[PDB]
Amino acid sequence: SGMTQFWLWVGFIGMVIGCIYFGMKASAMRRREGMEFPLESFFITLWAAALYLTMILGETVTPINGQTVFWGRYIDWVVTTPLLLMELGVIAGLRPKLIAGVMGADIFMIVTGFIGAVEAPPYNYLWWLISTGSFLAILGSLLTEYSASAKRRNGRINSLFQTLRNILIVLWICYPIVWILGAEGFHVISVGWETLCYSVLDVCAKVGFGFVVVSAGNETLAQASNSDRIMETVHSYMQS
Amino acid sequence: SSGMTQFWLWVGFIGMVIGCIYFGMKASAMRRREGMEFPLESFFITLWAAALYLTMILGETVTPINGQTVFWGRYIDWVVTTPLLLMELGVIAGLRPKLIAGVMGADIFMIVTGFIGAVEAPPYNYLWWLISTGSFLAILGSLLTEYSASAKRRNGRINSLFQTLRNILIVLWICYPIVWILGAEGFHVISVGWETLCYSVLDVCAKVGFGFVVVSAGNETLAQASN
Amino acid sequence: SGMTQFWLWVGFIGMVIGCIYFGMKASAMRRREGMEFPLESFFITLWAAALYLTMILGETVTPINGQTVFWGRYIDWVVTTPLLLMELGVIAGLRPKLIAGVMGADIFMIVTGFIGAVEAPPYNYLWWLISTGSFLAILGSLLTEYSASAKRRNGRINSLFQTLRNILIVLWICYPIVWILGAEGFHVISVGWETLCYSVLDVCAKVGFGFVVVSAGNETLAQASNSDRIMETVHSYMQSEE
Ligand SMILES: *C/C=C(C)/C=C/C=C(C)/C=C/C1=C(C)CCCC1(C)C
Ligand SMILES: *C/C=C(C)/C=C/C=C(C)/C=C/C1=C(C)CCCC1(C)C
Ligand SMILES: *C/C=C(C)/C=C/C=C(C)/C=C/C1=C(C)CCCC1(C)C
Ligand SMILES: CCCCCCCCCCCCCC
Ligand SMILES: CCCCCCCCCCCCCC
Ligand SMILES: CCCCCCCCCCCCCC
Ligand SMILES: CCCCCCCCCCCCCC
Ligand SMILES: CCCCCCCCCC
Ligand SMILES: CCCCCCCCCC
Ligand SMILES: CCCCCCCC
Ligand SMILES: CCCCCCCC
Ligand SMILES: CCCCCCCC
Ligand SMILES: CCCCCCCC
Ligand SMILES: CCCCCC
Ligand SMILES: CCCCCC
Ligand SMILES: CCCCCC
């Protein structure tokens, strides 16, 4: 009731703070290399801040079949989570075609998760399993193609990737658990407590995640986005 | 959905599920190799088609809109799979990337305008069918001109692979307006159950059958197609 | 209204005429380079023509909370307006990553404007201010990185960009003013005159804007789309932070 709107505000204020920070740093290096990382970090927080305002105002919260569905989360995630995987893919030096495949799996994961959030007690679990299935394929890529590519970059880029990869995996693994423990699955935790965990995860997965990216230095991010080094990484990754 | 409709929604589902395992196995086996995009594109095409077919089995994307029951999950399926099919065919033909995007934009326009007719009145569903068919002819033109005029300029065994897939695509895609205009969206001359039979047979042919011929071309061939 | 239906037809006819013109010039520039410009201009007018037809038939005009919302405009704008900024981005020689940022902010502008169009009198203004904020940042980029990159390019191309930029700026400024003075905000102007303004703005911003693009020489258009002349304006722009 009141706990839901309070923690919806905590998420919205957390997103806005990241917007000011990422937006300032992104426009401070508009002519530089590595600009795409604070730029992507800014749009991820911007899209999340808007959608969090849609839920605060109740614009994207709707009862479908007896359950109050916060469907604005899926409008958020279907855009922000592919951008996060793309941002991590550029740092890892992964081939863009494999990045597009991982982003495609992410869209499938979010869309099927939305179907489960709108489904009945029998079928909300079925779509949860299918979405989790694509989630494991994403986790497999983050530990295989992502890690094998980044290992072939300089030590500081591979160091930044592994930190961001571990941050991503630890945070994202909690999302389906919050989903299944909330109103979409087993109504064992309250909606307010579910709103609490989602906002804490969202701020960590977007603002805290983006902070680690921009805190790597202008030289690091410029090297991670450099075309010569990326094509060098993709080539070396393919010869094994 | 009725008994025949539900039966043929399952045939399309199983067809896409089978294609997923084949294309998915081949895709992750060519991960560090060239030509990987073709088994991967074929996998995502069958994967997105499989999920949408499941939504229609469960009636999640089956709804009455203006009296009629509209299977709007098909247009969620088509607006994604058909642009990917033309893009995969555009890379095999060695087409310029800017005109691949243009052909894909014309394809999205075709699916969207076709969806408007699916939910419209018998006066205006035929009007949008003609608009949708108009862009379909422009795509058939590009398939017979720019697609063929760029595959000629490439390796002789790639050009043969293109002409096979393209002629498969053209003959298959031509029946879709026929079923639509003869189905519930146009003149209801065939039943919804019989209409779903045609869509299931066509979808499995144009996705798993089409995708099979692509991956059945050899690894050194698909590597040359992606360079 | 009778006036809205009339001016919905004017916009629809204006978009169709633009389709015939740009489609003819596109199919006459097949294996030439610079083909993307009349083809981009053609798709912009085609998407707008189809969406204007959906509004004529009332398919995309619906009472949402009881206010008549022409939500087909936002289905149109969320597609055509990012293409216009992208097409202008290629002419200006702007780096593609910054083009994507402007395009993303443009989609943000249309989406938040659609939310305001369907919301109550308290919060329709709040989303109007949010959308106008991203509009100001886009105008900032048009005067900043767009102009700084086209300045270092050919004299014929920089002249074309500035003409298109001034045309875009002047036309796009009127949209939030029509919006806030129309049914979406304070209902100061009627639905009929609001339909007039949107039709007049849309035709000029798509048919007239694209006309200036295609009415440039095939020399200028081929040079504006060149891969390595776009790599050189990017290399010079990215290294001249002086
Ligand atoms: C910033 C928001 C983020 C990073 C959201 C991430 C969300 C997920 C990783 C959601 C995953 C889901 C599953 C794995 C299956 C069931 C439903 C979802 C959507 C909770
Ligand atoms: C795998 C699914 C495929 C390949 C579907 C293809 C569908 C079409 C080519 C549909 C075309 C239509 C028209 C040309 C006009 C009227 C309506 C449609 C959607 C049947
Ligand atoms: C061809 C159609 C065009 C160029 C439409 C342009 C529309 C805009 C620049 C709209 C801007 C808006 C704001 C700046 C804030 C409030 C709402 C909008 C959508 C009117
Ligand atoms: C490139 C590797 C990640 C993309 C592949 C997408 C696979 C999605 C897995 C679907 C699993 C379905 C569970 C039944
Ligand atoms: C009435 C619902 C029952 C559906 C049964 C479907 C059986 C599928 C037959 C085998 C399909 C094989 C496709 C290649
Ligand atoms: C496929 C290459 C681009 C061709 C342009 C596609 C647009 C066709 C629209 C036709 C509409 C016809 C209405 C009667
Ligand atoms: C490279 C293009 C710049 C993109 C920045 C987008 C800015 C959005 C501003 C939103 C402000 C919200 C109003 C308070
Ligand atoms: C019975 C629940 C209805 C499910 C709607 C599914 C929407 C899928 C959007 C692609
Ligand atoms: C009253 C209008 C009938 C509904 C038509 C819906 C068309 C949607 C086009 C996207
Ligand atoms: C630069 C701060 C942007 C804040 C966005 C507010 C929610 C759309
Ligand atoms: C080895 C680094 C792990 C980082 C995970 C932190 C998530 C809060
Ligand atoms: C009704 C109180 C729910 C408490 C849930 C706590 C989950 C960590
Ligand atoms: C760069 C040429 C692309 C024109 C078509 C735009 C995609 C809808
Ligand atoms: C590869 C498994 C397909 C599942 C369809 C929902
Ligand atoms: C190049 C990344 C910017 C994308 C914004 C949607
Ligand atoms: C009801 C307004 C929400 C729109 C989300 C795109």
Residue numbers in the entry:
A (entry chain A): -1 to 238
B (entry chain B): -2 to 224
C (entry chain C): -1 to 240
The paper states:
Rhodopsins are seven-transmembrane proteins that contain retinal as a light-absorbing chromophore and a light-induced trans–cis isomerization of retinal triggers their activities. There are, however, 9 genomes from a high salinity environment, 8 were from the same site and showed little genetic variation. Phylogenetic analysis of the amino acid sequences of the rhodopsins encoded by the 56 identified genes revealed that the proteins belonged to four known rhodopsin clades: XLR (3 genes), NaR (1 gene), XeR (15 genes), and CyHR (24 genes) and one novel clade (13 genes); the novel rhodopsin clade consisted entirely of rhodopsin genes from cyanobacterial genomes so we named the clade “cyanorhodopsin” (CyR). All of the CyRs included Lys204N2098R in the seventh helix (helix G), which is known to make a Schiff base linkage between the rhodopsin protein moiety and the retinal chromophore in other rhodopsins.
The crystal structures of cell-free-synthesized N2098R and N4075R were determined at 2.65 Å and 1.9 Å resolution, respectively. The N2098R monomer is composed of seven transmembrane helices (helices A–G) and a long C-terminal helix. The long C-terminal helix is bent at the end of helix G, Gly215N2098R, and covers the cytoplasmic surface of helix C–F. A pentagonal cluster consisting of three water molecules adjacent to the Schiff base of Lys204, Asp74, and Asp200 plays an important role in proton transport (broken lines). To examine the amino acid residues crucial for the proton-transport activity of N2098R, mutants at the putative proton acceptor Asp74N2098R, proton donor Glu85N2098R, or counterion Asp200N2098R were examined. Replacement of these amino acids prevented light-mediated change of the pH of the cell suspensions despite expressed as well as wild type in E. coli cells, indicating that these residues are essential for proton transport; this finding provides further evidence that N2098R functions as a light-driven outward proton pump.
